[PDB]
Amino acid sequence: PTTTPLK
Ligand SMILES: *[C@H]1O[C@H](CO)[C@H](O)[C@H](O)[C@H]1NC(C)=O
Ligand SMILES: *[C@H]1O[C@H](CO)[C@H](O)[C@H](O)[C@H]1NC(C)=O
């Protein structure tokens, strides 16, 4: 389970 790129 990964995540999106921090804005
Ligand atoms: C985390 O990154 C992976 C790539 O290895 C997938 O794109 C996955 O869908 C991502 N998870 C989220 C919650 O964006
Ligand atoms: C990145 O975007 C994804 C879209 O599914 C999720 O909302 C995730 O929580 C976001 N990550 C951050 C750090 O905001």
Side-chain angles (χ1 to χ4, degrees):
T2 56
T3 196
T4 19
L6 276 150
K7 193 179 270 276

